[PDB]
Amino acid sequence: QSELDQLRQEAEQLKNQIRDARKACADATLSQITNNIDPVGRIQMRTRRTLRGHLAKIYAMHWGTDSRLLVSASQDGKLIIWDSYTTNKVHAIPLRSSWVMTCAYAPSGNYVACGGLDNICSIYNLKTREGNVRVSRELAGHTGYLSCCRFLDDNQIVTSSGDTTCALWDIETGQQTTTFTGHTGDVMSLSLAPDTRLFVSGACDASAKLWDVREGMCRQTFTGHESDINAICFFPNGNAFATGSDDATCRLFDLRADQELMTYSHDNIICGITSVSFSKSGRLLLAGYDDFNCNVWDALKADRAGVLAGHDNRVSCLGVTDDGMAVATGSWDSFLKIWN
Amino acid sequence: LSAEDKAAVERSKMIEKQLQKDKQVYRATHRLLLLGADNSGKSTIVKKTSGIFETKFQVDKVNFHMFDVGAQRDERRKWIQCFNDVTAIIFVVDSSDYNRLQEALNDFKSIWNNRWLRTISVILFLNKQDLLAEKVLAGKSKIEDYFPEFARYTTPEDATPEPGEDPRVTRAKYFIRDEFLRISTASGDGRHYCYPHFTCAVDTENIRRVFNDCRDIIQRMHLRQYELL
């Protein structure tokens, strides 16, 4: 029993050392250094296209690499592939389990993945010889609901789950090749690095982490939020990532500084973020909300600029294209909207 | 008016035609979330190593899909939000333990007050009535040291099931029922309700009991849209 007390004391003192080292490494706040810089100015955004057809609420969505097609998974048991230029539907894949919580689009455009409460991940082969889609692989093996997929490339996908782990798979092999452990609550979302070399993962313990797909091992562990982290994404340079949590709102972290730079709050905002994605230049942080809105926070300023009101139920997913031309927001009212 | 785009628009209409006859199946079934205690979960009388379990049963040519969550970790404040559109939540309580009954009361209270479940009515199955009958009649374990209020509770105006019910067993039986009903009526806004039932371990007349309460739930939902109620 005394050894447990000794280990607890060691952990407490090492945490004190960590927090003191992070202290005094910060000279000026991002607000102070970004004081002369001019505001973005109130931005007005309007729905250019409203995609209809999903029956129940939408839990996830993902833009394609061409910034033209996107997949969206809804809990009616279907995920369908749109053409956001013409609102036409390219595919409509029926799922085996209706409780899908995430989806992803393969960079090559050949594959689409999905997963949900049921602890599994399914890879769908789009470009097929027969012309009819079919499940190419089921990546079974971990407990707990699966809450985010993100194809590294063809034949390699990374998954986050509610068993407080993350895994790296081998699609053709079908076996976990690496597993990332250390989170204590459910892992809600992860974002691959722009160079597809690391990734971040916020969890239901109000703490984020950074990994490396080469050898499974946590590099940094950023704290600061007060409740469940709901979404996370990389800043375009790959040297930052903004995570929006249920605590109040959103935050920005820098890997190399290893400390929160600055937050994004306001008194009226009283619910929690549901999904986050940066803009192309990392100058417009976008964020979903339980109040059915999607605020548009300028990254460098602590004051929001625009609002994307238009959804009837809560907003669950949003993502900016690779060319930055458009922004899509699915929501629990079962509609997608393409703002520009 | 393009030429190559004709094939795409033709394709988007085959999909719409297929989605159209899936809309009328998705709306013709009722989705029930089967929650409750770890034990007393009986999705067998109602008749690949993980995830979620689904059993489909049909009553009066109405289709029900009931999802028994399994193989999930302990914390459930986050995947519970997936079931905000189910027609009803079935909550099964193991009475006749007196020990984890309070831990089942608190569990039902959290369900009632959740922000994403405020409109979903729960069907309450006070399960294991047979064990309750034996427990009070034996008298070895007495329900006073877990709920002091049982020293003053008097049986209400109700319907004892059969002539032969001991007044004691029909008193404790209804006392537990009222504990859940205090929690249910606290959120006074009548946007959802709780339907109590005294189930047993095995009861044939148990699939229909779910049917009638969903029938009541739907009717009560339609009458609200017409401001008739």
């Epitope: 239901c204 313990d205 007060e226 409740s227 605590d247 929690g272 | 404040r77 831990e103 608190n106």
Partner: nanobody, 128 residues
Framework: QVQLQESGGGLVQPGGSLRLSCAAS????????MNWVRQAPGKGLEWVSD????????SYTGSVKGRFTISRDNAKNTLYLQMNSLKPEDTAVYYC?????????????????????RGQGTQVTVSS
């Protein structure tokens, strides 16, 4: 990072008294519900008492009803559980708890594996 430090446990004769003070830091205070959960040896951990944001919706487990008193000091960032008449059945680790969300009236916090916003624990032992 959030913290929940509790203190007050010790050896007490039956019918004695104790005070359990919960020191919190690293997260908004008033905005949340707070709970008391104890873990008696040889079985699982159970919920005891709760108090809302303002501090006006007290509620107890029947076992300790009419015996224990809770109080929230928002200014002090503290929570208390006054203990009046001990029994040898309350001998247990105590765990100051927090709700996972703010401005909300529900809490799934009894969990037996890894709930994060929960105190580290103090042992109260009642014997002779």
């Amino acid at each position: 990072q959030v913290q929940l430090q509790e203190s007050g446990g010790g050896l007490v004769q039956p019918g004695g008294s104790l005070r359990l003070s919960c020191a919190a830091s690293g997260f908004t205070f008033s905005n949340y519900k707070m709970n008391w959960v104890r873990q008696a040896p040889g079985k699982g951990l159970e919920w005891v008492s709760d108090i809302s944001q303002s501090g006006a919706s007290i509620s107890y487990t029947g076992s300790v009803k009419g015996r224990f008193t809770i109080s929230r000091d928002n200014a002090k960032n503290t929570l208390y559980l006054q203990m009046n008449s001990l029994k040898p059945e309350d001998t247990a680790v105590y765990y100051c708890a927090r709700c996972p969300a703010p401005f909300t009236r529900d809490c799934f916090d009894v969990t037996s594996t890894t709930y994060a916003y929960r105190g580290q624990g103090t042992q109260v032992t009642v014997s002779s």
